[PDB]
RNA sequence: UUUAAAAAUUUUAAAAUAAUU
């Protein structure tokens, strides 16, 4: 647990960008689906690869 | 057949190979006792009946 | 979902062994894996597979799904028997957290 | 080859091994029915004489 | 239906069912060459996409 | 083609089978996963196999 | 051509992979629908033909 | 690799050229499906690699369809590879890839 | 004049290199330790190599 | 206020260390190598070499 | 040559002490199995000294 | 002995592949399942 | 079919193979 | 992990490699002492923990 | 009295493929 993410948050700016171009539903869907991964696993890295392809 | 069914012994002819592979012998030489006995003996669990 | 899918794949790779039981061996009920080329009864998947492989005239071997499975079981036995791999975990228990 | 290569299972206990490998051939009762055949053979030879 | 009727042997060859060979390869290549874009979009029309 | 070989034994693993090293190479991707986990990634320098002159 | 063969069998995992066929591929659907709605009554179906010049 | 293989008096590549460039086989010579990985190198080393793993079945298939001769080759035994590989267009792709 | 020329000649006659796909793996230790020129059951009188080759 | 150790401790006296051989963990390696040399020495144990 | 003579010595000395269980089996367990199997045989043993 | 196989059989029927011989087919399916009266005759019978 | 193990040549009977 | 982070000690098998590489071994042999320990001195699952 | 270590150099100049600044 001590190695959890501690860099500053990326929430307000991301939602601002998503709202300025109408892509708010997509941003909210990604921001929601990402918060369900809490284990460094093959499945989470596959999630990142798929989201970035 | 029933001796095979009952007996606990098991013949695995890799003991011979693993013991003959540790022999120290040169290479500039036209004879090799290890290879010679491995050829003469041919350890194979095909017919140990 | 992908979680169940990767989990099933990991199980299909890692669960190539029946179990680890402490009991004296036995021909009938000693987990003796019987071959068919000859009536012998071996006490391990890798042992039975080395049996069947030494059956087959080593000079005339070619690639086969059987050989692939043989090498995979031989490979995963070592990773299963490594001690750090035996005793290790990622998630904390109540007692260790306490 | 069989006399040079030979090994037991990992940790065999011979009493248990034979206790559960010798059971079926003694549960199969067929040697008792051969003594009657021997009786009949001797009876037949004596009757012939 | 269309692509199957064209090159079923090639489907079998590259899908790990039938042994590969040069004849199926070159026949399939013929099928690729002698083939039109209207044929492409008709083949796309044949696909019964789900919801 | 005058030389023959012999496939004897599976070498011991060179990396843990639970450690993601490249996203997409997981147990779902069987052959790359087995090659990566039984050979191990690159961390060395072994250039120039007979580039002598 | 490639997808006509269907699913595949894994010599390592000993099972057919679960990858959805073309009937779950929304990029192909959007491609076909855009080409349709652009072509309309015209017999020619390609919205432009790429050529050397 | 088929759709980009023919074009105009035609000139076609046999699949053996593509196997020479690096692309790994699937089901050649009556073997099991999906035996070869792509990590097989490209060229003579890769060719030797994928051949030596199948050579016994590779020659028994040849002998099982006609191709037979009275010449004990050290590699392929009695089957006449020199005629069949010419027939199966193996030499052709193997030497066209090098051009 | 140093470095006798039995190595440059072979290096110039044969073209055997590490393919592209092996760059991510650890082929060096595979060359060093896990391709053994002494066969499994000992010498053979065929696999013997002369001292000056 | 005490900590036990399975090996001997001896504080250094320079904060810029350089190599030396005088310690029990090197003497142990020396002893082991000496006895390995011994059991390799005679032809009583390794005759084919 | 001396190398070949020494290699033959090594092979013989390594073959005389080969960790095989077959002689111990023939001494300790084989007669017990023969005696356990004999009374159930259809054709009883027929020996001479 | 060192037998081989030749020609006839091809039905994998677990993964729809075609093999080189029925013996190879049998070995293949086995791998699947594994991973994943004269008087002398009268006297003998007697 | 009976196959050699030195050159992979295939024969059709054990005496021929020997 | 705390000891590893606080210690000024490093580990590298190149020391063993360079030490072994200085002994002269015959090219025409069947046993390589320097090349055997280098093989069996690489930990499994590459963990030096 | 017989065997053997053999050189691990560069930065390799140009032409094609791919990755990047
Ligand atoms: Mg830039
Ligand atoms: Zn058997
Ligand atoms: Zn199958
Ligand atoms: Zn032959």
Automatic annotation (TrEMBL), chain A:
Compartmental location: Virion
Section of the entire sequence shown: 318 to 370 of 1267
Protein name as it appears in the record: RNA-directed RNA polymerase
Domain of life from the UniProt record: Viruses
Gene: L1
Family: Belongs to the reoviridae RNA-directed RNA polymerase family.
Upper classification of the organism: Viruses, Riboviria, Orthornavirae, Duplornaviricota, Resentoviricetes
UniProtKB/TrEMBL annotation, chain D:
Entry superkingdom: Viruses
Localisation per UniProt entry: Virion
Role: Inner capsid protein that self-assembles to form an icosahedral capsid with a T=2 symmetry, which consists of 120 copies of VP2, with channels at each of its five-fold vertices. This capsid constitutes the innermost concentric layer of the viral mature particle.
Name under which the protein is recorded: Lambda-1 protein
Organism name: Mammalian orthoreovirus 3
Residues included from the entire protein: 884 to 932 of 1275
UniProtKB/TrEMBL annotation, chain H:
Subcellular location: Virion
Family membership: Belongs to the reoviridae RNA-directed RNA polymerase family.
Protein's recorded name: RNA-directed RNA polymerase
Record organism: Mammalian orthoreovirus 3
Parent-protein start and end of this portion: 846 to 951 of 1267
Automatic annotation (TrEMBL), chain K:
Compartments it resides in: Virion
Protein task: Inner capsid protein that self-assembles to form an icosahedral capsid with a T=2 symmetry, which consists of 120 copies of VP2, with channels at each of its five-fold vertices. This capsid constitutes the innermost concentric layer of the viral mature particle.
Name of the protein in question: Lambda-1 protein
First and last residues shown, out of full length: 786 to 834 of 1275
């Amino acid at each position: 647990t001590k190695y959890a993410r501690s860099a500053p948050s990326n929430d307000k700016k991301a939602r601002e960008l998503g709202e300025k171009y109408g892509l708010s539903s997509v941003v909210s869907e990604l921001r929601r689906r990402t918060k369900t991964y809490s284990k460094h696993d093959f499945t989470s890295v596959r999630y990142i690869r798929d989201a970035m392809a | 057949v029933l001796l095979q069914r009952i007996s606990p012994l098991q013949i695995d002819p890799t003991i011979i190979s693993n013991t003959m592979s540790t022999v120290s012998e040169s290479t500039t030489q036209t004879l090799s006792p290890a290879s010679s006995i491995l050829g003469k003996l041919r350890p194979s669990n095909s017919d140990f009946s | 979902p992908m979680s169940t899918r990767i989990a099933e794949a990991t199980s299909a790779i890692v669960s190539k062994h029946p179990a680890r039981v402490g009991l004296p061996p036995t021909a009938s009920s000693g987990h003796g894996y019987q071959c068919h080329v000859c009536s012998a009864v071996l006490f391990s998947p890798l042992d039975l597979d080395a049996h069947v492989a030494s059956h087959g005239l080593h000079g005339n071997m070619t690639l086969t799904s059987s050989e692939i499975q043989r090498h995979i079981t031989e490979f995963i036995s070592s990773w299963q028997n490594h001690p750090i791999v035996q005793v290790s975990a990622d998630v904390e228990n109540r007692k260790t957290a306490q | 080859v069989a006399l040079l290569s030979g090994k037991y299972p990992p940790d065999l206990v011979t009493n248990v091994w034979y206790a559960d490998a010798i059971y079926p051939m003694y549960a199969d009762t067929e040697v008792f029915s051969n003594l009657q055949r021997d009786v009949i053979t001797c009876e037949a030879v004596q009757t012939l004489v | 239906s269309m692509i199957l009727t064209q090159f079923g042997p090639f489907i079998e060859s590259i899908s790990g069912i039938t042994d590969q060979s040069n004849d199926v390869f070159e026949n399939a290549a013929k099928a690729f060459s002698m083939f039109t874009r209207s044929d492409v979009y008709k083949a796309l029309d044949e696909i019964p996409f789900s919801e | 083609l005058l030389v023959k070989w012999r496939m004897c034994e599976a070498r011991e693993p060179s990396v843990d089978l639970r450690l993601p090293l490249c996203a997409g190479i997981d147990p779902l991707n069987s052959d790359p996963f087995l090659k990566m986990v039984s050979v191990g990634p690159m961390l060395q320098s072994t250039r120039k196999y007979f580039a002598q002159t | 051509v490639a997808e006509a063969g269907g699913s595949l069998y894994d010599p390592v995992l000993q099972k057919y992979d679960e990858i959805p066929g073309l009937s779950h591929n929304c990029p192909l659907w959007c491609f076909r629908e855009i080409c349709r709605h652009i072509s309309g009554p015209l017999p020619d179906r390609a919205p432009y033909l790429y050529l050397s010049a | 690799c088929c759709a980009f293989s023919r074009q105009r008096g035609y000139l076609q590549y046999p699949m053996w050229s593509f196997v020479y460039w690096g692309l790994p086989l699937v089901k050649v010579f009556g073997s099991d499906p999906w035996i070869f990985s792509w990590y097989m190198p490209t060229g003579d080393l890769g060719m030797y690699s994928w051949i030596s793993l199948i050579r016994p079945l590779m020659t028994r298939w040849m002998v099982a369809n006609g191709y037979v001769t009275d010449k004990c080759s050290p590699v392929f035994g009695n089957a006449d590879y020199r005629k069949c590989f010419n027939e199966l267009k193996l030499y052709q792709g193997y030497y066209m890839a090098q051009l | 004049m140093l470095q006798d020329v039995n190595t440059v000649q072979l290096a110039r006659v044969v073209n055997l290199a590490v393919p592209d796909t092996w760059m991510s793996l650890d082929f060096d230790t595979m060359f060093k330790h896990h391709v053994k020129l002494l066969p499994k059951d000992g010498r053979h009188l065929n696999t013997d190599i002369p001292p000056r080759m | 206020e005490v900590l036990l150790l399975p090996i001997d401790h001896q504080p250094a006296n320079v904060t810029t260390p350089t190599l030396d051989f005088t310690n029990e963990l090197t003497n142990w390696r020396a002893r082991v190598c000496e006895l390995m040399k011994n059991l390799v020495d005679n032809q009583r144990y390794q005759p084919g070499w | 040559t001396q190398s070949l003579v020494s290699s033959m010595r090594g092979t013989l000395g390594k073959l005389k002490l080969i960790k095989s269980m077959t002689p111990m089996y023939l001494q300790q367990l084989a007669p017990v199995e023969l005696a356990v199997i004999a009374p159930m045989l259809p054709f009883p043993p027929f020996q001479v000294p």
